[PDB]
Amino acid sequence: VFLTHLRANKNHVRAAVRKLYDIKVAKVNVLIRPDGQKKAYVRLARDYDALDIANKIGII
Amino acid sequence: MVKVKCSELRIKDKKELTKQLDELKNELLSLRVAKVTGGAPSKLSKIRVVRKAIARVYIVMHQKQKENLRKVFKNKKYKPLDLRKKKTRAIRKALSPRDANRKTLKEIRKRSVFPQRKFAVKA
Amino acid sequence: AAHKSFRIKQKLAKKLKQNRSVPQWVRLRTGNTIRYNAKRRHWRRTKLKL
RNA sequence: AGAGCAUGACAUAUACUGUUGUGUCGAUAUUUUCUCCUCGGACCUUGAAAAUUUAUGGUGGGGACACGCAAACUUCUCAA
RNA sequence: GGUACAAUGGUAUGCGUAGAAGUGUUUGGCGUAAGCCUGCAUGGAGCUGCCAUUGGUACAGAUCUUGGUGGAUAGUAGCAAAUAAUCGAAUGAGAGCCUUGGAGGACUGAAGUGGAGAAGGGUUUCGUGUGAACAGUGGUUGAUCACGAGUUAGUCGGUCCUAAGUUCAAGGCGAAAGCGAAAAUUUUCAAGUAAAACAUAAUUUUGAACGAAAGGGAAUACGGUUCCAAUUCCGUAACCUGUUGAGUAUCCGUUUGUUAUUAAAUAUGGGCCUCGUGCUCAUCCUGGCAACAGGAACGACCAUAAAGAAGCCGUCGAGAGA
RNA sequence: UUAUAUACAACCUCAACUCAUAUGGGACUACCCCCUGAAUUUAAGCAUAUUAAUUAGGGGAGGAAAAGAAACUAACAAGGAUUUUCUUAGUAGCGGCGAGCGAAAAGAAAACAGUUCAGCACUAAGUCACUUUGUCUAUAUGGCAAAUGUGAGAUGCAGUG
RNA sequence: AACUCUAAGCGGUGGAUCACUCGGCUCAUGGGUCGAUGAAGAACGCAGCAAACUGUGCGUCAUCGUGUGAACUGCAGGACACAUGAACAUCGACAUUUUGAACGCAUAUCGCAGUCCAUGCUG
RNA sequence: UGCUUGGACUACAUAUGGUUGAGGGUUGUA
């Protein structure tokens, strides 16, 4: 999960996390929160397991 | 570190300005991660320190490139509207003084035969 | 309404974040006068007219 | 996938789970539900429009030739 | 004529943190009176007498204005519509509530007080925490208050199409604004081209856009999952749109396996020729008397037809659900 | 050319362009210019009148704007563009001659600044805008020259006046 | 020490009175500056902890250059970035989101285009 | 070719040129 820019259209978020984190994406879903911030549930592929990617990001 | 100075940023190249731009971008991305994951120092307050550090690499890159366009749009009439003297709208239109005070040949000929003489009166 | 526009959802979002209290350090600044929040709305007592 | 689900017989302590059986017949009347089809009536009242889509027809024009190499925006089947 | 208030000009070698203004008061007074001086108490930084000149200059009333307060009244005001709760337990500082769970008596009675949506609302949802205020009794609870979280789509909607209508476009008009016009204005105002020849050449003007989360309109369902979301996540099985790719309506008589008979083979006919391999002809699919059928079998434009495309009351029959 | 049958030309009236270059809308409100224009009120009623050639409405500019160098006064012994103040003057006039209204010349000040066209026997288009090329020295809707390149211009551009 | 009447004292309720004043108002002076080079205005975003106001525009409570020359402060954190310059002013550089006269068409829509240049995935 | 991403542009009215032009509107060498 990320919080993204309010004007990022899901081909941004798919292309953002490729450039930043050297991964590939299965699917992106997208929300706009009731405080007004766009979420993006970035489901990775089956190869890039998200725990090896989460602690390299910095989160647990 | 050293506070990144615009004075010392200006002596760099085009490559080193945008290669210093991404690595300060990458710090702010990592400090953005660490703000909400419970950054263990009482603050890694390099948020504002690198937030304004990239503003100046931007400022220096942007005025190293507008000062270069002003070097190319020397000698050309019809320079861009941004490399062209926004004074006020009223001042830009109002007869550029090189012909606001040009004169008819009839008035240049009344000008050169009776100058205001310079005199004094009393007995 | 549960079908809103993008523009009513952002004006509803901004009035949602503006519905916090005053932080309590703000009453610790020097010569401070702000005591409560004077622009708190409830959802049930004052309506937004949006 | 005795799938899954649900009812149900045990077994396994949170010790990070397995398992045996069932799930079958018949026939009502729902003028009171929803759909589908039929066939009507009232009216000096006759009960929308457009994108969209298809079939046909037409003049030209396109292709196709056997001693076989083919084809097919192919109104066919599949794949990325 | 006199007295209160505030100022300005002079004046008092005025007063004042050793306590000014103000206020309070059975301190003592003075004045016919308006009012004044004084003590003490509170108060904490300014103020008074005189001469002149003044002015936003004196309050009991205006169903005066602003604010505060009293009775009435702690109440015979009242908190009585929608049947109704009771037991025991736990928590707690305190329990009839909403706090919980158990048992139990009841009600809504499905045209519901059940379960979902549209307007509207906007975080009220949810978890944890909770102290005042609020919940016209209480409150340990809350749609309250603090903190943390939560809304996932090619298939559901919007978005696309028009309706009634609307906004604009220079015929116009008006001093203009603008018509509370509806312009329908407007030399070629619009189309068309695997795009041409003694005009390239055939054709059309109501311009334009908006206006339906109930009309029209491509495509998805189940099982599972959460403190909080699901036709959106997960698993499983499909589908639509667009763009490429692959397979696959034309695997002959001659003559290879084969002497012809044939076999590979939607598959030839003709005439002669040593037969023919010589020569020549031929495939934009077949079947059925028909109603029509099959896996495909000339969307490149014109033309016509149909679908979209529809009301209301009834109705035999069928299936579904119950 | 033009039996609207081969061209060719040139003008004139009009088009078109996501052509090159440019220009314009909107804001403010105190003053300013152009417009449109009431009624309360007063007249002890009320219609003309008054309020008012004003509130409101509309449009357009500038640091001021408008005005402005006589188709003006006077009747003198004559004055001499505009605008502002003083006075004229609550006057002359105007008015249900009621309510009311109401200027100007002269005089005294402040300030002072004057001019340009069209139209004649100017008597060689004697002019201008682009664009390009030399080449000056703002970051120039500039400076000069060259080609006088393309156009405006004889349905009249400059100079004189 | 029922209640009542009246007075003062003490406590309350209330917020007059007086004394204050980074605010009004009135008079005068100097000056002349918006916008298609996108104004005024609107909207939403932006702070280590911020809701408002104030400031600003993804470079987002700032900003180049200058001036001055040690702070800023509610709390941290850093100032080894005077001693090659904090914080402030100043502002001439760069910049300024969606809008708005608002200009591809619309807009109770973050809706629908075109033309073009590039990159990022076939060949 | 292929989908994405970023950028430049695409309003109207006008002036002057440029460029393409219309008109049996006047005419002309043939």
Short mmCIF file of C-alpha atoms in Angstrom, two decimals, chain A:
data_model
loop_
_atom_site.label_atom_id
_atom_site.label_comp_id
_atom_site.label_asym_id
_atom_site.label_seq_id
_atom_site.Cartn_x
_atom_site.Cartn_y
_atom_site.Cartn_z
CA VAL A 1 0.00 0.00 0.00
CA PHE A 2 1.14 3.53 -0.78
CA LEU A 3 -0.19 7.03 -0.53
CA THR A 4 0.27 8.62 -3.89
CA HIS A 5 -0.18 11.97 -5.55
CA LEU A 6 -3.84 12.89 -6.08
CA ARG A 7 -3.31 13.05 -9.85
CA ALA A 8 -1.48 9.75 -10.47
CA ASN A 9 -3.40 7.53 -12.88
CA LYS A 10 -2.39 3.89 -12.15
CA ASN A 11 0.06 3.82 -15.06
CA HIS A 12 1.98 6.30 -13.00
CA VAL A 13 1.92 4.08 -9.91
CA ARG A 14 2.78 1.02 -11.94
CA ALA A 15 5.66 2.90 -13.54
CA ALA A 16 6.70 4.65 -10.32
CA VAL A 17 7.36 1.53 -8.28
CA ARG A 18 9.26 -0.06 -11.15
CA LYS A 19 11.68 2.87 -11.26
CA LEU A 20 11.99 3.19 -7.49
CA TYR A 21 11.94 -0.40 -6.25
CA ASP A 22 13.03 -2.58 -9.25
CA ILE A 23 9.94 -4.81 -9.20
CA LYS A 24 6.98 -5.69 -11.37
CA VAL A 25 3.29 -5.33 -10.69
CA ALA A 26 0.39 -7.69 -11.18
CA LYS A 27 -2.38 -5.22 -10.49
CA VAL A 28 -2.88 -1.73 -9.10
CA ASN A 29 -6.09 -0.72 -7.45
CA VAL A 30 -6.75 2.88 -6.48
CA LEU A 31 -8.80 4.66 -3.87
CA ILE A 32 -9.36 8.27 -2.90
CA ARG A 33 -9.60 8.52 0.84
CA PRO A 34 -12.29 10.57 2.59
CA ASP A 35 -9.58 12.97 3.70
CA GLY A 36 -8.70 13.35 0.04
CA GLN A 37 -5.51 11.34 -0.55
CA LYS A 38 -5.13 8.72 -3.23
CA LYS A 39 -4.16 5.20 -2.05
CA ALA A 40 -2.76 2.54 -4.35
CA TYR A 41 -2.85 -1.16 -3.50
CA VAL A 42 0.04 -2.43 -5.59
CA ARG A 43 -0.18 -6.21 -5.84
CA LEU A 44 3.18 -7.52 -6.88
CA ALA A 45 3.77 -10.50 -9.12
CA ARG A 46 4.32 -13.98 -7.77
CA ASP A 47 8.11 -13.72 -8.02
CA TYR A 48 8.67 -10.49 -6.09
CA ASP A 49 7.46 -11.53 -2.66
CA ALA A 50 6.41 -8.44 -0.80
CA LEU A 51 8.23 -9.19 2.43
CA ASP A 52 11.64 -9.03 0.79
CA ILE A 53 10.44 -5.80 -0.82
CA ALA A 54 8.95 -4.32 2.37
CA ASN A 55 12.04 -4.51 4.54
CA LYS A 56 14.24 -3.23 1.73
CA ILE A 57 11.88 -0.24 1.52
CA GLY A 58 12.41 0.42 5.20
CA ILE A 59 9.10 -0.69 6.64
CA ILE A 60 8.83 -3.96 8.58
#
